[PDB]
RNA sequence: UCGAACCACCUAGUAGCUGGUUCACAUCGAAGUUUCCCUCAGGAUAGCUGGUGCUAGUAGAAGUAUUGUGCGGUAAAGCAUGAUUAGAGGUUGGUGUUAAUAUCGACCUAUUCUCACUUUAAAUGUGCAAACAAACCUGCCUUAGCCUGCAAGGCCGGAAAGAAAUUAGAGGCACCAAGUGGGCCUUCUUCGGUAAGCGGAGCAGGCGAUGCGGAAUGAACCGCUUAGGGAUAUGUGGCGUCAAAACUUAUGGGCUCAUUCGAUACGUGAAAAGGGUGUUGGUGGAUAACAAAUCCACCGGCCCCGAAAAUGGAUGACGCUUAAGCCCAAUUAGUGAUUGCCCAUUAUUCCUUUGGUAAGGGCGGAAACUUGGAGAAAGUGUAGCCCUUCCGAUGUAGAUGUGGCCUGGAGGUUAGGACGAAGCUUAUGGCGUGAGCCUAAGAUGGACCGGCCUCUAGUGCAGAUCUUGGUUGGCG
RNA sequence: GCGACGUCGCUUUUUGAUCCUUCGAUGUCGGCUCUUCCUAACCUAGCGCCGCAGAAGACGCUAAGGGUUGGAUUGUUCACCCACUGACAGGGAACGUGAGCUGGGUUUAGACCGUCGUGAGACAGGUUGGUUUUACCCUACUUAGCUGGAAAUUGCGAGAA
């Protein structure tokens, strides 16, 4: 029924700094800044050191509690990347 | 605190006027009472031995003592009945302290997910697991 | 209520049994009945002359009358709130000498002959032994039971 | 829509009525060609003989098994051959059926028939299934078994009620397992009879002294 | 007034039809079935029931088992009387063929498929018997039977005891008489019908005729069955509020998110397959590679859709969702063996009544510190002769009893009344379970009348589209 | 888009049963009039999708919100045409609706006819003529007033968005 699988980790290099305050994430860089919200079941966001590691542990787990962990992993890396690299969007037409 | 103690029920078939020394049958059943142990003692012999509770006598039912209270693993080969897929067996390896404890969780798991209750449930091989 | 004749609803009742048909016994002709003994009024067919009504078939009762070739049998009939001692007149072949008392005919025959043997008699030969009591039973084959599928 | 869709006889609220000295005007069922395919077929040909046994006490009419005699049949050619399959039907519509047609015109309206003179007359025939009835048995190779998980479901959905495939460990019209069957041909335990065969049992008779004179 | 006027009379015409039929309590208490009937809206007859009984009645007892001993042919089963039939191919007809060939029927075979006919083949049933003459050791008589004695009948004495359970809540008849003779529901099974909240049955239970307790609600279901009270404890059902009880249990095992979740049976049935690429469970079978783990097939739902109506809208309401849902468990918390807790016309116990004619004991004078009774009378019945003891206590139709109630009058007796009788009024109390009685007080009444024992009847009224009188609403 | 064969859920303005309620009276269809309700969507409304280039249709889903006619013949319901229209959808409300109307059909007593019957008469066959009572009562609604009222008339009882 219920089990545990693993833990999720992200490294935070120079040029990017992440907080943990009110369990929310602040990521800044040298090309832009962005902050948002990533709450979910058993998903308590705690950043260990200021520039060491973004860790998000859950203690319970099932198909739904575990199909929601690594989406914050999909939504924390692009915080750290967009503040340094950024992704451009292009649009075309025809006539 | 876990109900459903473990009973050691043994019995001949009222010797005999025919065979004069029928083979003794012993088996261990988890039950709330011993009246419920004998009730399910005379269901195995009525089926697995074709012996009635009338034409036989219970030799010595007994309460198994215990194991030194310490956590360990348990795989309980359990066989239930239901209109929900009639007569399926199962394994459902539990991790409780005593055999009484784990088989309790076995019943409270089947009645939880298959709604199969005490009399629709046979048990076999309540053993332990090292790893 | 279209048909209620003297022989209604009695196909299987008067029908002879399987592979035993034909003439009645020579025992049933050589029986000996008195006024007073008991008789099973088991109406057999293949005689078809003197069979009683259906009702009096599993019934046993006193012989109040023994004519030359007709036994007269009283039989209790629970009519509605009382039983009638019916007085049926059948022939002998529809009659067995009823065992129904060998249960104590043969009991008090040897039961007294040994109560006398136990009271005065000549000697008291030991009889049937006790039935239900305890015992330290020694097994001869162990076993268990889990399942067979 | 003019004939009751075989549902008002899904329960044995009535006796069985046999075609007998009782009923005398019984009509004809449209299911006739029970067997289909290789016909003189020998017995060593197909390894698998799966049954199709029902589950409940349903009652299917003469109109759904008759297409199962064709529906569960036809899908051979589209994914197999006819001569590589045994299509033998193993039932018959025995229970002759009555019918009461109310509201006659000879008389008045809505007060002509006050429930009298209103019993049955022949209309057709249906069947009584109880738990454990074989609808349509199957014989096949190994490379032809999963064929009629469709063809059956093609005709299992022509039926009133449901059904299942019964994977078997028998050698068809015999009482022998497959694993030991390859061993019995090694010692020739079983004989042949045409499209079927009979088992030489224990208590063998002195008659078949098959050894050289 | 006319498909036979009107008046009076026969005539109070007859009505198996409709309506009504006047007090109390107590003791019991049913039936809608049998047969017969121009019978089926009714009768008669049995059964049911009451009263009065008679009688030597632990027996000629039993909706029970045991033991023996009979009986049976339904369930299941199985296919000979039949089947039902096609599948493998080969005597008998017709025929399409070139003495060679089939062809379908009949047949021939191993079968087959699934049914009514088969068999001492159930369960449940039911018939019988089971301790003082049923066996004996004997002895009569007429001998009926059969050629002295057997056996037989009507007898009989000498002798006989049990080393078929229970209740052993007493057996047996008899008489008189009602009421009922429209049942319905239900369990189990089952005939007919498309079906039914359908018709017809068998069995038992109910309702009727009956409450109480709770399934929100309901003649019937679940408990329990019923004199008036108190307490203790339960039953069914419950314990989030309504609502007494987990003041939301220290609850434990899992399950469940449901854009109408789900949640007390029987109410009627809720939802049928079907699938999935869904959440949880299980089995068959790979890789050690998915795009250090990842597969190919299905079993199982909870759950998603499939699915829908018309006043507004129902788990009963709110509401509940890390439950107050579901399935399992629990019952003071893995510390040590019991009743977590709340509710009854039930149970237990305690008083009180009342009946049983239920048992007893006194049934005319003595003492335990204060009075009551083992001194209140020989008695159906009361304001009981007195104590005390057991048990039962509902009830429609009906029956019966009452030292029982009441009205008018008679024969007796006792007695009132102008110092106020009947009557009448009632926040006039009391006292009787009640019918009712008695009292007081009338800024009522004015002249008759109460108690008791018998007698007597035009004797009790809420209800008849009652009758008569009067009033009233609507209504200024 | 459906159609072989078929089947399986749910359907009432359904064909009949059932005999449960009503026989000391629930007054008969259809209309008129008026209100409501449902969606299984007829129209408009929202995308969707095709052998949907424009045009124009095509299939589908979402939505009860609004809209859904005027006539001829028929007592009609239905049906049929006529014509408009964006289209003239399908239902419930006791087959919504007579102490509201109407009285055409059912509708009796008159009469004629057809068949039937010996006849009186019968026909659920046709034709014609044929009562339609009562609100002044309670509530519902509709408007029209009046007056009490916070322990919703009471305790002094005490709570201020
Ligand atoms: Mg059978
Ligand atoms: Mg009996
Ligand atoms: Mg009751
Ligand atoms: Mg309810
Ligand atoms: Mg109490
Ligand atoms: Mg829980
Ligand atoms: Mg008088
Ligand atoms: Mg009078
Ligand atoms: Mg009066
Ligand atoms: Mg009156
Ligand atoms: Mg109208
Ligand atoms: Mg007009
Ligand atoms: Mg009003």
Supply D165's token pair: 């495939």
Residue count (chain A): 95
CB < 8 Å to B49, chain C: 145
Q: What is the maximum alpha-carbon separation in chain D?
A: 88
End-to-end CA distance of chain D: 72
* Alpha carbons A45 and A62: distance in angstroms, whole number: 19
In 3D space, the residue among A40, A6, A7 whose CA is nearest the CA of residue A23 turns out to be: A40
Q: Which residues on B lie below 8 Å from C136 (Cβ)?
A: none
**Angle A76-A78-A81 (CA atoms, 0-180°, nearest 5)?**
115
Strand E within 7 A of D18 CB:
yes
**Calpha distance C14→C7 (Å, rounded):** 9
- Distance between CA A24 and CA A47 in Å, rounded? 10
> Rounded distance, CA D49 to CA D43, Å?
11
Q: Comparing C-alpha atoms, which of B4, B22, B5 is closest to residue B13?
A: B22
Strand ranges of the sheet holding D136-139, from the earlier edge strand across to the other edge: D36-37, D86-89, D136-139
| CA pseudo-torsion sign A58, A61, A65, A66 | positive
Shortest CA distance to B48 belongs to which of D159, D197, C148, D42?
Answer: C148
Nearest alpha carbon to residue B88 among B118, B107, B112, B116: B116
* Structure determination technique employed: cryo-EM
Say yes or no for a CB contact (<8 Å) between B25 and C143.
yes
Collapsed DSSP state (helix, strand, coil) of residue A64 = helix
DSSP run (H or E) holding B43 = helix B35-48
> Residue A32's closest CA among A95, A94, A82, A90?
A82
Reference B103, options B128, B82, B131; nearest CA is B128
* Inter-residue contact D117 to D176 (CB < 8 Å): no
CB D197 within 8 A of CB D191: yes
Residue pair D18/D94 in contact by the 8 Å Cβ criterion: yes
Q: Which of residues 61-120 of D touch strand F (CB under 7 A)?
A: 61, 63-64, 66-67, 70-71, 74, 102-103, 108-115
CA neighbours within 13 Å on the CB side: how many for D125? 21
Q: Give the distance from residue C130's alpha carbon to the nearest chain B alpha carbon, in angstroms.
A: 13
> Chains meeting B at 3+ CB pairs closer than 8 A?
C
How many angstroms is the resolution? 2.8
- Reported residue count of chain D is 213
CA distance A33 to B27: 72
* Chains interfacing with A (3 or more CB pairs < 8 Å): none
Q: Which of A44, A34, A37, A36 is nearest to A69 (CA)?
A: A44
CA C73, CA B46: separation in Å to the nearest integer? 47
Tokens standing for C72?
């007269």
β-strands B25-31, C70-78 pairing:
unpaired
A1 touches strand E (CB under 7 A): yes
What are chain C's partners, defined as 3 or more CB pairs within 8 angstroms? B
Strand partners, C71: C66, C90
Sign of the Cα pseudo-torsion (C59, C62, C64, C66, in order):
positive
Distance between CA A40 and CA D165 in Å, rounded? 46
CB distance C22 to C46 below 8 Å: yes
Question: How far is Cα C40 from Cα C59, in angstroms, rounded to an integer?
Answer: 6
Q: B21–C140: do the CB atoms touch at under 8 Å?
A: yes
Instruction: Return the H-helix or E-strand segment holding A73.
Output: helix A70-74
Of all residues in chain A, what percent are helix, strand and coil, respectively (each to 5)? 15, 30, 55
C144/chain B closest Cα distance in angstroms: 5
C-beta separation of B103 from B7 below 8 A: no
Helix axes D148-156, D71-79, angle to 10 degrees: 150
Please indicate whether, in this complex, the C-beta atoms of C144 and B27 are within 8 angstroms of each other: yes
Sequence-separated (6 or more) residues with CB below 8 Å from residue C10: C54
Distance CA A22, CA A42 (A): 16
The C 46-105 residues near strand E by Cβ under 7 Å are 57-61, 75-76, 78, 80-81, 83, 96, 98-105
3-state secondary structure B74-128: EEEEEEECCCCCCCEEECCCECCCCHHHHHHHHHHHHHHHCCCCHHHEEEEEEEE
Dig out the tokens for D200 from the structure. Answer: 């030489």
Cβ contacts of B120 within 8 Å, gap of 6 or more: B80, B81, B82
Is A37 exposed, middle or buried (CB count within 10 Å of its CB: 0-12, 13-18, 19+)? exposed
Alpha-carbon distance of D135 to D68, in angstroms, equals 9
| Amino acid C5 CA to nucleotide E179 C1' distance, rounded Å | 36
Tokens of A18: 């992440």
Q: How many other C-beta atoms can be found within 10 angstroms of the C-beta atom of residue A18? A: 23
In chain C, which ranges are continuous DSSP H helix?
11-14, 27-30, 102-119
Q: Ligand 3: distance of its center to the CA of B92 in Å?
A: 49
**For chain C, how many residues are written?**
149
| CA–CA distance, D14 with D155 (Å, rounded to integer) | 27
Helix (H) or strand (E) holding B36: helix B35-48
Instruction: Using a 7 Å cut-off to protein CB atoms, list the covered nucleotides of chain E.
Output: 46-48, 67-74, 82-89, 110-116, 118-120, 125-131, 134-135, 152-154, 161-163, 190-195, 252-256, 273-275, 278-283, 298-301, 327-331, 333-334, 336
Interatomic distance D10 CA / F38 C1' (Å): 35
Helix segments in chain D, DSSP class H:
65-68, 71-79, 148-156, 178-187
The encoded tokens of residue D60 equal: 């299917």
- Which chain C residues have a beta carbon less than 8 Å from that of B59? 137
d(CA D120, CA D100): 4
Angstrom distance (rounded) from CA A83 to CA A17: 10
Placement of tokens 């090292």 in the chain: B130
Q: Would you give the end-to-end CA distance of chain B in angstroms?
A: 27
Residue B121 CA to residue B81 CA, distance in Å, equals 6
SS3 at position D181: helix
Q: Which nucleotide is nearest to D3 (CA to C1')?
A: E194
Nearest Cα neighbor of A28 from A87, A83, A86 is: A83
DSSP code at position C54: G
Structure-token match 């309980």, residue found: B76
Report in angstroms the alpha-carbon separations of B119 from B30, B76, B82, B116, C34. 11, 17, 11, 8, 61
Looking at beta carbons, which residues of chain B come within 8 Å of C143? Answer: 23-26
Per-residue tokens: D24: 């005398």
Question: CA D79: distance to chain centroid?
Answer: 23
Give the strand pairing for C70-78 and C83-91. Answer: antiparallel
């Amino acid at each position: 029924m219920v089990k545990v699988k693993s833990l999720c980790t992200l490294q935070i290099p120079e040029g990017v700094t992440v907080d943990v305050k009110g369990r929310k994430v602040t990521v800044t860089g040298k090309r832009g800044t962005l902050t948002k919200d990533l709450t979910h079941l058993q998903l308590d966001l705690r950043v260990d050191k200021k520039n060491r590691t973004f860790t998000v542990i859950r203690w319970f787990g099932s198909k739904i509690p575990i199909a929601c962990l690594n989406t914050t992993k999909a939504h924390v890396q692009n915080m750290i990347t967009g503040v340094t690299k950024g992704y451009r969007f292009k649009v075309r037409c025809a006539y | 605190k876990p109900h459903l103690r473990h009973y050691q029920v043994v019995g001949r078939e009222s010797p005999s006027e025919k065979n004069p020394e029928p083979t003794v049958y012993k088996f261990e059943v988890f039950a709330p009472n011993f009246v419920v142990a004998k009730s399910r003692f005379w269901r195995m012999m009525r089926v697995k031995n074709k012996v009635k509770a009338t034409h036989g006598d219970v030799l010595s039912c007994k309460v198994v003592k215990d194991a030194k209270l310490v956590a360990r693993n348990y795989l309980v080969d359990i066989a239930y009945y239901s209109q929900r897929c009639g007569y399926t067996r199962m394994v459902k390896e539990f991790r409780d302290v005593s055999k009484t404890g784990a088989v309790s969780q076995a019943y409270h798991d089947l009645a939880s997910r298959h709604r199969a209750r005490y009399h629709n449930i046979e048990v076999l091989n309540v053993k332990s697991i090292p790893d | 209520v279209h048909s209620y004749g003297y022989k209604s609803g009695t196909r299987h009742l008067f029908a002879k049994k399987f592979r035993k048909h034909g003439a009645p016994s020579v025992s049933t002709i050589l029986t000996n009945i008195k006024v007073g003994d008991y008789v099973d009024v088991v109406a057999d067919s293949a005689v078809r002359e003197g069979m009683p009504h259906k009702y009096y078939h599993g019934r046993t009762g006193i012989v109040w009358n023994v004519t030359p070739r007709g036994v007269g049998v009283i039989i209790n009939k629970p009519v509605r709130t009382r039983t009638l001692r019916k007085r049926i007149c059948v022939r002998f072949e529809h009659v067995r000498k009823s065992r129904c008392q060998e249960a104590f005919k043969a009991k008090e025959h040897q039961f007294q002959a040994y109560l006398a043997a136990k009271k005065a008699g000549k000697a008291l030969p030991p009889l049937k032994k006790s039935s239900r009591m305890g015992g330290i039973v020694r097994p001869k084959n162990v076993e268990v039971l889990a399942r067979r599928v | 829509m003019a004939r009751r869709p075989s549902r008002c006889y899904r329960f044995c609220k009535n006796k069985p009525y046999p075609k007998s000295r009782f009923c005398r005007g019984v009509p004809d069922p449209k299911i006739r060609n029970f067997d289909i395919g290789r016909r003189r077929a020998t017995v060593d040909e197909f390894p698998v003989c799966i049954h199709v046994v029902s589950r409940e006490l349903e009652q299917i009419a003469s109109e759904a098994l008759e297409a199962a005699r064709i529906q569960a049949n036809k899908y051979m050619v589209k994914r197999a051959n006819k001569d590589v399959f045994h299509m033998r039907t193993r039932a018959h519509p025995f229970h002759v059926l009555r019918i009461n047609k109310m509201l006659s015109c000879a008389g008045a309206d809505r007060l002509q028939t006050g429930m009298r003179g209103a019993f049955g007359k022949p209309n057709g025939v249906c069947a009584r299934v109880r738990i454990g009835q074989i609808l349509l048995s199957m014989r096949t190779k190994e490379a032809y078994v999963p064929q009629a998980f469709e063809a059956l479901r093609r005709a299992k959905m022509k039926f009133p009620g449901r059904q299942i495939i019964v994977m078997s460990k028998y050698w068809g019209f015999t009482n022998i397992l497959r694993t030991e069957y390859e061993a019995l041909r090694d010692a020739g335990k079983l004989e042949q009879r045409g499209t079927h065969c009979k088992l030489i049992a224990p208590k063998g008779k002195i008659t078949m002294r098959n050894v050289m004179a």
